[PDB]
Amino acid sequence: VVLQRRDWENPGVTQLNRLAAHPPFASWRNSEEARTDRPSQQLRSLNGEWRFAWFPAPEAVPESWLECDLPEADTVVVPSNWQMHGYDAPIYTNVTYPITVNPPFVPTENPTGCYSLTFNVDESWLQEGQTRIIFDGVNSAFHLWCNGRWVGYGQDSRLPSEFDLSAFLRAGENRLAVMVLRWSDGSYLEDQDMWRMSGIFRDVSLLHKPTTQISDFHVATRFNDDFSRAVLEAEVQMCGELRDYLRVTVSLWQGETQVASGTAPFGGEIIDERGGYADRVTLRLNVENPKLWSAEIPNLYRAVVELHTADGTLIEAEACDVGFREVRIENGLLLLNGKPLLIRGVNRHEHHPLHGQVMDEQTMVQDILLMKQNNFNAVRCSHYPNHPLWYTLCDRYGLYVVDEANIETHGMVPMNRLTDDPRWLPAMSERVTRMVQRDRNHPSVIIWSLGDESGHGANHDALYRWIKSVDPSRPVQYEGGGADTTATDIICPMYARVDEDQPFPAVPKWSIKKWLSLPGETRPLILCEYAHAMGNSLGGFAKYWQAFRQYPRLQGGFVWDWVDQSLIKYDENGNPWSAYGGDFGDTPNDRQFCMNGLVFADRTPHPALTEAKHQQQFFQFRLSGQTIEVTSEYLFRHSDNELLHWMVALDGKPLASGEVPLDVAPQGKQLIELPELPQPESAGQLWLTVRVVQPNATAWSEAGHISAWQQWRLAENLSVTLPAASHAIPHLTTSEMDFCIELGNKRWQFNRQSGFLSQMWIGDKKQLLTPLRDQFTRAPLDNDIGVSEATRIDPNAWVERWKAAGHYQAEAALLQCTADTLADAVLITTAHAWQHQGKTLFISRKTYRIDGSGQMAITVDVEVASDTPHPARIGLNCQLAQVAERVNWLGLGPQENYPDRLTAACFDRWDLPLSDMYTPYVFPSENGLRCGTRELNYGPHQWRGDFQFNISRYSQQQLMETSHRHLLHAEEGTWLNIDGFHMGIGGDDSWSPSVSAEFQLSAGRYHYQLVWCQK
Amino acid sequence: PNHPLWYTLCDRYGLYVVDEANIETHGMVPMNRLTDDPRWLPAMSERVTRMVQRDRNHPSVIIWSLGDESGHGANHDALYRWIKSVDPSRPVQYEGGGADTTATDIICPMYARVDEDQPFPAVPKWSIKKWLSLPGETRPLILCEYAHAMGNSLGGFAKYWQAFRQYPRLQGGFVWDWVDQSLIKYDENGNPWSAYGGDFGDTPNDRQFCM
Amino acid sequence: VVLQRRDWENPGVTQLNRLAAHPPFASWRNSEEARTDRPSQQLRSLNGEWRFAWFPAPEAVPESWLECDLPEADTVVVPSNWQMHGYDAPIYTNVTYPITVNPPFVPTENPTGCYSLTFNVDESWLQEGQTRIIFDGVNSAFHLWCNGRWVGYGQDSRLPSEFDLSAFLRAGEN
């Protein structure tokens, strides 16, 4: 009947013989074990070495497999995705379905994974009670056999599927056979923007329950107006024979102290004309002055639910962590424990570069520590229920969670084709209902989400109301169909900009500030997705946070996203490298769009992470005279693990410093008076830097952790002293092809045909490998490119506008190149025009003044045609002959920063190895810029002025021609790009131009000056 | 849902119709055991949605009903909202779980009395006059069933109509019911007679309660 | 598959291969006929004399019935309730379920009505278009075969169940 019914092509069949969903069970038979959350003898892991065989279609699986192991099969670790073992290719596609859109049908060629296990079952498990098997995650559908006999079927890749094996098992040795289909009717609701994989990728376990058992339990906490009193309400359901002697005790523990306890027989209150639930009981416990749960202080109690006889014989105990907190929306504000939240959120997919979509405790803990260390307090489970341990860790470490149903139909046309179709309501309903049934007792879950990018259909409205009816304790959100539909309590747009409207027909993305005040609108706004962190991105991040802080009903958002979905591949030499879409032969694919993270797949931070940390700081600062004002944005805690370090420096030279403990009440202010600082010995700018340091280690951070910082300019003393007049005069030598200038052991050469400095000598060693030339382009960022491809041009993308205008191929044409000998200097004057097919794009006019001190002063004046697309940069570049170890600069750093992403950077004296001056984005682009730089040092060279720079072994050309970082080769010498001006990087999204007007180079005329010397 | 011709005739002759989904779980303990169970939501959804899909163009249909005597469960709320979303042109009513739940636009009790309260726990049947003015209550009241016309009955019928006429928000009701459910049997002489519960050897049965 | 799956004891299966519900259709090929609500040549009644046999359970139904009329069957009027023809007793109960309350299961003794019809289909219906069968009311669940081949399954006694027969029908007798 199995191959004949084809249940994986029927949205009316999502399971067969599957047990009801429920909160995490362990069936403890000792109450103390339940309290302490120790392992349970009744819950066994079936994880480890299994048997696996791959087949092209279910029709190709031999019947012998049901009863006997296939000799050709391999021994593989489970949980796993079989693409990660190389059995077939993972596919990266974004919107377009990885299969033909023909609901409910999938392809006849349907990769089929045949898993099997031979394992022991102890006799005690079969004499009495119930033995069930739990598959936490199977992608995407499966049939189950036990000892050759058919058990059942399950769909939904992201929630547990449980089956009763009581009648199927024998004492001693048993064999499970699992046939896992890659594609099913379930796949139509699983079109998330991620790698498409398959297999048994979450834990497998056996659970023993007594016949008379706790089958469900719900925990609720309600409060008085000031949260000084709480009632814990626990509804408990049983299965088995009802008996007068049966009791439930719910006890609440704070550590080893029992705080409250309730005991009752079964039999609920009257519900309707037919009575009540005889198989249910509700316990109500009073808690005075409850310690409240939040992301700031994740206070937890332990609830123990004991099923027992009147006389005190335990039948079984279940348990959970309890966080006392109230989530509600009032007067248009999302409140936690009566206070308005500011969501410092991030979207997080379950991704490992080696193990695919299999999650482990270590990786989960790594992510949480990094999140909190970078001032995140919230996470969205994009876009499916997570591995059950995730919620446990969010409960205990303290993160707000949006729990999201595994429903995404992005690739449908229109997007709501299935979600507005009542035929798909049953499949949809199970993805929502079984999520709520599983996760409703986790305090970390504060908001339910109906899924992602599935338009808005009537099925959403029905399921929205279902959740509101079953769980009034949490708001329900959903972005589909324009982010403010009748199926959402929160306006939750994706990539809506701060000030700029994007008025798409039917689904406009209004300016978030404007959206709040639309006629009739009263809801809070929290972006489900914003600041698309794809490659060199997060430009304009500060603009969001300024708006979040100014507007009460702008309550933050979730960054897209946490971790690059790159996968490890190996080259001919067995060296690992990071791969994206298309690198596995997968086609169609969406290339590097799988990498949008604040961190690399191995959890190394992108530069953007520090900008997020700084903007999401919990302390705000103002300076007035000698007074620093510190304001706390904590809602609940006092600053009892914080001290303020202050430092004053003159152009990087430390002048004074000190510490002051912070004592700020939540949302309070502290004034700190700086001591009178002695005036500087010399000329320059004084800078004040403050840092908030955490003296003590926490559960989530080490001692000395810096949580916040800020900088101000103090007094500036402008240099008025003239440099000592030298007695030497540079000597000009002229040929037909060159102007040469000599001073001591120094020599400069200007090519009279090109009009550029072609060479410089110190002693008689060449300093340049490539002449010093103007540069108006950059190796395009992911944001510059957008969705543009060679086969499908998007003429609107910045890269295509520059290409079509001829920016990348425009050649310098010399207009003027003269030399004059002065009193104590040689003056070279040049003029160039960059042209494309008769059109002059840019004009550059320069003077180079070389004096008797050996300093070369370069003055640059650029004109940009008003009708050419604004250029990516206005600067100079050259390839230096020198390769030096260190890069030393006075400017913004230490990390990579761009004009619209530099708030996190501090002005100071920085010194890094050359390799740190390059950011290894997996898709190579312009990278490693540092802005606001007044002095740059590299080997013998020093440049002074007010510029942006990057410096590395890779030319802009190589960066733009190479599609993977592992294929980059260090070039001879060092490429230096020194810009007077550089365009913003953008990132509000990565599929339309997102660089704000104020960060585009539109001024028409530009001026900058540089001094080049040897030190 | 009725035979399709019924709606054609109500359209043409002129009767207001309440179209009711084929869902009644009266015998469950408690009455909402299935309708509050998410696993029965798919079966229930089809009985509601396929009714609306079939009958939504009939002018005679003025109100949708979610079924009858199935308590009040979360499945009712889900389906209430589905209809409200798909067809804003008709109010949705449903009596289960106390006749004034979040799954009904109309207070629609059965056998609520005019002046006399019947304060059953959980699901009281208030005096219809008193029900209207309960704190916070603003909805119209139309009994889905009243005046149980079993045998020699309809005593006090005039008391309903006096109240309907006096109170604007008391907008009437549906008598229970139109036609005796008796079946013809034949005796030894071949003579026809009217039969009720039990007369076909059917047991357990509810005797003359079908009339 | 039919007896093995027991679709009538699974609330997750309420139909198989059933077409989407819709308002009353007649597929007129003339606008004036549609306007006047006059009969449509494309909508045919199958009401009348059918073949019928009663069984105490679906397990008691012989395989031969799928492809050949059972000689012991009677000719009865359809639409009908088979209790009104005297094949078993009608049951009057108010609140208490007529069956043991044990969801999703029903009694193993489950009265089964086997209906059949031999009919002709107009030639032009086989060459082009779509031919569907509509059952306006079947109490309480049913499987459908056409010319020995299984078509689908349906529940809900009070709404139409419709099935595409286009791939099942033949020239002449069906």
Ligand SMILES: CC(C)S[C@@H]1O[C@H](CO)[C@H](O)[C@H](O)[C@H]1O
């Ligand atoms: C490219 C847009 C049309 S869709 C856009 O794609 C992004 C790519 O990372 C993300 O998946 C977003 O969730 C989605 O809105």
Ligand SMILES: CC(C)S[C@@H]1O[C@H](CO)[C@H](O)[C@H](O)[C@H]1O
């Ligand atoms: C007998 C009551 C407890 S239930 C009562 O039974 C009546 C009998 O005609 C009707 O069926 C009503 O709808 C029902 O409420």
Ligand SMILES: [Mg+2]
């Ligand atoms: Mg299916």
Ligand SMILES: [Mg+2]
């Ligand atoms: Mg998507």
Ligand SMILES: [Mg+2]
């Ligand atoms: Mg069924």
Ligand code: NA
């Ligand atoms: Na705000």
Ligand code: NA
């Ligand atoms: Na992506």
Ligand code: NA
């Ligand atoms: Na590149």
Ligand code: NA
């Ligand atoms: Na009235």
Ligand code: NA
């Ligand atoms: Na009756």
